[PDB]
Amino acid sequence: GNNSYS
Amino acid sequence: GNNSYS
Amino acid sequence: GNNSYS
Amino acid sequence: GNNSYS
Amino acid sequence: GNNSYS
Amino acid sequence: GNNSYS
Amino acid sequence: GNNSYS
Amino acid sequence: GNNSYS
Amino acid sequence: GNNSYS
Amino acid sequence: GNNSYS
């Protein structure tokens, strides 16, 4: 799917 | 702080 | 699925 | 801070 | 901070 | 999918 | 800061 | 997909 | 800062 | 797809 990393 | 939304 | 990492 | 949206 | 949107 | 890194 | 939009 | 890096 | 849009 | 780097 989608990845949001911070 | 930081926000990671998915 | 989707990954949200912070 | 930083924002990562997806 | 920095913003990454997708 | 899409990746948002910060 | 910096913005990356896609 | 699309990548937004910052 | 800098902006990268696509 | 498209890449936005900053």
Side-chain angles (χ1 to χ4, degrees), chain E:
Chain E
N2 288 8
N3 308 123
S4 287
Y5 296 174
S6 72

Side-chain angles (χ1 to χ4, degrees), chain I:
Chain I
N2 288 8
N3 308 123
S4 287
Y5 296 174
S6 72

Side-chain angles (χ1 to χ4, degrees), chain B:
Chain B
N2 288 8
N3 308 123
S4 287
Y5 296 174
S6 72

Side-chain angles (χ1 to χ4, degrees), chain E residues 5-6, chain F residues 2-3, chain G residues 4-6, chain H residues 2-4, chain I residues 4-6, chain J residues 2-4:
Chain E
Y5 296 174
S6 72
Chain F
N2 288 8
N3 308 123
Chain G
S4 287
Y5 296 174
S6 72
Chain H
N2 288 8
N3 308 123
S4 287
Chain I
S4 287
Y5 296 174
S6 72
Chain J
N2 288 8
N3 308 123
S4 287

Side-chain angles (χ1 to χ4, degrees), chain D:
Chain D
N2 288 8
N3 308 123
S4 287
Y5 296 174
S6 72

